[PDB]
């Protein structure tokens, strides 16, 4: 017996683009500031170029994380996919933001001189992209990211997904109602669990607290004396004698440039971390979503079947579907079957015996069948296999050649 469960993992994608006013954050409204800053060679073009390159990198990350398709697929008007409830995943046009209830729930759960640039892609086209990807993965199967899309019905697609993990497709059609009920119950349980657990959403919130703290600590360091006479431009450039006030403001802007270059260092380290996370997210997007990935752990605890991504603020959230078997049963096996001096070997499974009778079964499910020659192949003789047992094999079409 097998239990279908859904697991959720989240991956951050990108952060808000940042642009800093360089000479305004250093010191503003002063000609002495200008003529002492222009003679430092260049401490500002490098930071401006690096920050713009980081912003371009975040925009590019938003590009290849979410836009893997050049077509915008639309869902069919029929809501009956075979008894399977695709209502908490597929977006509905009744909502003003055109978002799924899961996406709306996670969005509601998710809560000078510095300028924060708006992203190129806001929430609405990301939601449209998620709708297009879910349409491609539901009504077109997995044969849409490799060439043109094809009309694929849902149940035989699910049978193909079971066939990809070494399980015969006949087990689906005798238990389709149970699979549909289990998948709907898992969807309901995970929809309740996304809102019940408060600590299922951390890194994204943590990393945005990192961004907010790094933004606030720059202004916090803007109001420090830096070992000078004062920390205010109009108090240090009017009361003091410019023979020493030039040195005082030089030390102050030196401390300020050290502070902002330290902030730029933390920003580039965090941007490299975000870029690596977005690259791994793009790998997950290409493998776990656009097709079936057979490697374990890579797409869900257990055997991977498919996944459904949803739009998230400054990130992406995955909804894996895993094939987890259960209800173990002890049996007695044998490496080969001895018959008429020659050994028999299984083609697709293993010889399984409960008592005094032997049957052949598939690897991941119990389906006892009579041992015949159409699913066995002979090799060698019955003198070398260690642990072989004596048992007759059914010869096919027997009562047929004499009738």
């Amino acid at each position: 017996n097998f239990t279908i469960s859904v697991t959720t993992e989240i991956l951050p994608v990108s952060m808000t683009k940042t642009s800093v006013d360089c000479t305004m954050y250093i010191c503003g409204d002063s000609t002495e500031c200008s003529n002492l800053l222009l003679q430092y060679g260049s401490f500002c073009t490098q930071l401006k170029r690096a920050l713009t390159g980081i912003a371009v990198e975040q925009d590019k990350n938003t590009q290849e994380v979410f836009a893997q398709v050049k077509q915008i697929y639309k869902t069919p008007p029929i809501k009956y996919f075979g008894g399977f409830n695709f209502s908490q995943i597929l977006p509905d046009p009744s909502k003003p933001s055109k978002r799924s209830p899961i996406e709306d729930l996670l969005f509601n759960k998710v809560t000078n001189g510095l300028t924060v640039l708006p992203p190129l892609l806001t929430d609405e086209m990301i939601a449209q992209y998620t709708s297009a990807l879910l349409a491609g993965t539901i009504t077109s199967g997995w044969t849409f990211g490799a060439g043109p899309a094809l009309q694929i019905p849902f149940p035989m697609q699910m049978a193909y997904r079971f066939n990809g993990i070494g399980v015969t497709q006949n087990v689906l059609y005798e238990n389709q109602k149970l699979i549909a009920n289990q998948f709907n119950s898992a969807i309901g349980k995970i929809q309740d669990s996304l809102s019940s657990t408060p600590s299922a959403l951390g890194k994204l919130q943590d990393v945005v607290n990192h961004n907010a703290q790094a933004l606030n600590t720059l202004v916090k360091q803007l109001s420090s004396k830096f070992g000078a006479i004062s920390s205010v431009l109009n108090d240090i450039l009017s009361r003091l004698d410019p023979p020493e006030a030039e040195v005082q403001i030089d030390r102050l802007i030196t401390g300020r440039l050290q502070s902002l270059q330290t902030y730029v260092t933390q920003q580039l380290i965090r941007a490299a971390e975000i870029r690596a996370s977005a690259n791994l997210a793009a790998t997950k997007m290409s493998e776990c979503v656009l097709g079936q990935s057979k490697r374990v752990d890579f797409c869900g605890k257990g055997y991977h079947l498919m996944s459904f991504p949803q739009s998230a603020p400054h990130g992406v959230v995955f909804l894996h579907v895993t094939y987890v078997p259960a209800q173990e049963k002890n049996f007695t096996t044998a490496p080969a079957i001895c018959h008429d001096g020659k050994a028999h070997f299984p083609r697709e499974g293993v010889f399984v015996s409960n008592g005094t009778h032997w049957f052949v079964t598939q690897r991941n499910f119990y389906e006892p069948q009579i041992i015949t020659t159409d699913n066995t192949f002979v090799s060698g003789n019955c003198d070398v296999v260690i642990g072989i047992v004596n048992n007759t094999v059914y010869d096919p079409l027997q009562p047929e050649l004499d009738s």
Binding site: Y73, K74, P76, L120, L121, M125, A149, I152
Partner: protein
């Protein structure tokens, strides 16, 4: 990020845009700006970015497609 009420002019959700008219039609994005705004030289016009062709695919309970 500047509301230009003190300094053709079309208002985007990124600040002020001066010198680029707004066209209700949509085309493929060439120069990214922000908030779903992309401008290209057709004069210079600003349009909403195109997500692609709406290639809707039919679905039924017994329709399959096999390439030849």
């Amino acid at each position: 990020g500047v509301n230009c009420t003190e300094v053709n002019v079309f208002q985007t959700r990124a600040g002020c845009l001066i010198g680029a008219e707004y066209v209700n039609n949509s085309y493929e994005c060439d120069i990214p700006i922000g908030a779903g705004i992309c401008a290209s030289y057709q004069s210079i016009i600003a349009y909403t970015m195109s997500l692609g062709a709406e290639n809707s695919v039919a679905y039924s309970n017994n329709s399959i497609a096999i390439p030849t």
